[PDB]
C-alpha cells in the first residue's frame, strides 16, 4: 500500500524524527 | 509554498446551506489535516472540523450536527457544507493546514495551523 | 473541553515597551500552546509554535514561554508595527482545538 498513516490520539514519537527539528520540538517519548 | 484559497457564495439565506471549498496549491491533500476555522466580526476564532486521509473527518461539537467536509477526487480540494444557517453563521471563513508528516505518517496532535487561506466573509440574511 | 483564558483583553503601550500577554489552560496541555498574530482584515499568522518555538519569519523580539496550564507571549520591545490581536490557541485535544478570546493591542503616542 501507498496510503501514508494517519494518527490523531497519539503524539509524535521521537523514534521517527530523524533530524527534522519540527518533529523534534512536539514529539514524546513513546 | 503550499497555498490555500477559499470560494463560495457571499450572501446565504436563513435556513439554506452555506457551501465552500478550499483550493490546495503546490500540494496535495492526501497527507496532511485539513481544516475550517471561521471568525464573526468583531468576535474570536472558533475551530469548525478537519479531515483527511481518504476522506475520515471530525467536528466541533457545537456544529458538529449541521456540519460536513469533504475531500475531492482531485485530491486538490476540500470542501465544507453548513445547514440550516442563521445570522449567527455570518463570518469570515478560513481554511487552514495542520498536523506533522514523515515519510509514512501523519500526526495531528500538538500541532499548529499553517498556512491559513485569506478568508472569506458569508453573510446569512435574507 | 479545554478552555483558554487570555488576560488582558486590551492593553496600550508605547513604542519601546515591555508588553507580556497571559493565558491559562482548564487543564494541562503539556507545551501545546501556539500564538497567533491577526492584522485588521488578514488571516492570523503564526508566531510561536508549541510553547516557545520562534516560527521562521519572526522577529525575537517576540517569545513564549510556561508549559502545563500557564503561558506568556512577550514582546521586548513593542513596535508601531505590532499593532494587532493576539490569540494562543491549545491543540492538546484530541477533538475540538480552542483559542483565547484575543488581546488587542494599541499603540500609544
Known amino acids: 500500500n501507498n496510503d501514508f498513516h494517519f494518527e490523531v490520539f497519539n503524539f509524535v514519537p521521537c523514534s521517527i524524527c530523524s533530524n527534522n527539528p519540527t518533529c523534534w520540538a512536539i514529539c514524546k517519548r513513546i | 509554498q503550499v497555498q490555500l484559497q477559499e470560494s463560495g457564495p457571499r450572501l446565504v439565506k436563513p435556513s439554506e446551506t452555506l457551501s465552500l471549498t478550499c483550493t490546495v496549491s503546490?500540494?496535495?491533500?492526501?497527507?496532511?489535516?485539513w481544516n475550517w476555522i471561521r471568525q464573526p466580526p468583531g468576535k474570536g476564532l472558533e475551530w469548525i472540523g478537519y479531515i483527511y486521509g481518504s476522506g475520515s473527518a471530525d467536528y466541533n461539537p457545537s456544529l458538529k450536527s449541521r456540519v460536513t467536509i469533504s475531500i475531492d477526487t482531485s485530491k486538490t480540494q476540500f470542501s465544507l457544507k453548513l445547514t440550516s444557517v442563521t445570522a449567527a453563521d455570518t463570518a469570515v471563513y478560513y481554511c487552514?493546514?495542520?498536523?506533522?508528516?514523515?515519510?509514512?505518517?501523519?500526526?495531528?496532535?500538538?500541532?499548529?495551523?499553517?498556512?491559513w487561506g485569506q478568508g472569506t466573509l458569508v453573510t446569512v440574511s435574507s | 473541553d479545554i478552555q483558554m483564558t487570555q488576560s488582558p483583553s486590551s492593553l496600550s503601550a508605547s513604542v519601546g515597551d515591555r508588553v507580556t500577554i497571559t493565558c491559562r489552560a482548564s487543564?494541562?496541555?503539556?507545551?501545546?500552546l501556539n500564538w497567533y498574530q491577526q492584522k485588521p482584515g488578514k488571516a492570523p499568522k503564526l508566531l510561536i509554535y508549541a510553547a516557545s518555538g520562534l516560527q521562521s519569519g519572526v522577529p525575537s523580539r517576540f517569545s513564549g514561554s510556561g508549559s502545563g496550564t500557564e503561558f506568556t507571549l512577550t514582546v521586548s520591545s513593542l513596535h508601531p508595527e505590532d499593532f494587532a490581536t493576539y490569540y494562543c490557541?491549545?491543540?492538546?485535544?484530541?477533538?475540538?482545538?480552542?483559542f483565547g478570546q484575543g488581546t488587542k493591542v494599541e499603540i500609544k503616542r
Open positions: 503546490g500540494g496535495s491533500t492526501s497527507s496532511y489535516f
Open positions: 490557541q491549545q491543540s492538546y485535544s484530541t477533538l475540538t482545538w480552542t
Open positions: 487543564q494541562s496541555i503539556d507545551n501545546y
Open positions: 487552514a493546514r495542520s498536523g506533522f508528516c514523515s515519510d509514512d505518517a501523519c500526526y495531528r496532535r500538538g500541532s499548529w495551523f499553517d498556512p
